[PDB]
Amino acid sequence: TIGRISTGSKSLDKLLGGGIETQAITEVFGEFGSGKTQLAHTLAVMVQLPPEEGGLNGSVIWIDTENTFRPERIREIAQNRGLDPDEVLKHIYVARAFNSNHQMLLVQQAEDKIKELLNTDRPVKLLIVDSLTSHFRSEYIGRGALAERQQKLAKHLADLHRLANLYDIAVFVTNQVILAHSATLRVYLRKGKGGKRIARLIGEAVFSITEKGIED
Ligand SMILES: Nc1nc2c(ncn2[C@@H]2O[C@H](COP(=O)(O)OP(=O)(O)OP(=O)(O)O)[C@@H](O)[C@H]2O)c(=O)[nH]1
Ligand SMILES: [Mg+2]
């Protein structure tokens, strides 16, 4: 069965069919400030809620490539949704990827953690890669790079799709914006009037960024 993780926004959840899915890679893409990292921090709390509150009683693996994970933003979102900020942080396993090759290795390490927690009452249910593409865009540049970059990212995305399907995990990846993509679901995020963010699947959802992370 596909699990669904609430985003915190009822509007965005509706657009997604109820939340971010397990057994799928969901890519959010959009310009600087569009909400990609804030959505990631909000899902890393939401997935820890029980299912009747929109979570999967799950743990989180987060591969951070631009040093934008903020443990205090997690604690705030958790505190404000009525969860213990330190227990929520204990269930997020963060690793910094130093380059695209290290990023690829970290996905194989993630399988070790996933296997370990599979017999626990908080199995990994969410794997975040923020940003999926930043290192690949820095490292593979110039004539011949398009093909090489796309082949390396296809292998990385295949590794991630295997973990999502084999272990019933939601994979959530971000991309800052003609080239091919292989996410299961692609969600375009942009800034709207009045501080809102607007999401479109590639209706529209509208959400805010608040003390609770993301919400309508
Ligand atoms: N309340 C709160 N808002 C924040 C915080 N950090 C960022 N924001 C707001 O959230 C908006 C969305 O930011 P992000 O999710 O980081 O943007 P992004 O899409 O990841 O951007 P890039 O990483 O630059 O591609 C920002 O414009 C800020 O207005 C925070 O720690 N607390
Ligand atoms: Mg970001």
UniProtKB/Swiss-Prot annotation:
Keyword Ligase: no
GO molecular function terms noted in the UniProt entry: ATP binding; ATP hydrolysis activity; ATP-dependent DNA damage sensor activity; damaged DNA binding
Annotated binding of ATP, by residue: G30, E31, F32, G33, S34, G35, K36, T37
Gene Ontology biological process terms in this record: DNA recombination; DNA repair
Record has ATP-binding as a keyword: yes
Swiss-Prot/TrEMBL keywords: ATP-binding, DNA damage, DNA recombination, DNA-binding, Nucleotide-binding
Family label: Belongs to the eukaryotic RecA-like protein family.
Function according to Swiss-Prot or TrEMBL: Involved in DNA repair and in homologous recombination. Binds and assemble on single-stranded DNA to form a nucleoprotein filament. Hydrolyzes ATP in a ssDNA-dependent manner and promotes DNA strand exchange between homologous DNA molecules.
Name of this chain's protein: DNA repair and recombination protein RadA
Species of origin: Pyrococcus furiosus (strain ATCC 43587 / DSM 3638 / JCM 8422 / Vc1)
Gene that produces this protein: radA
Residue window of the full protein shown: 109 to 349 of 349
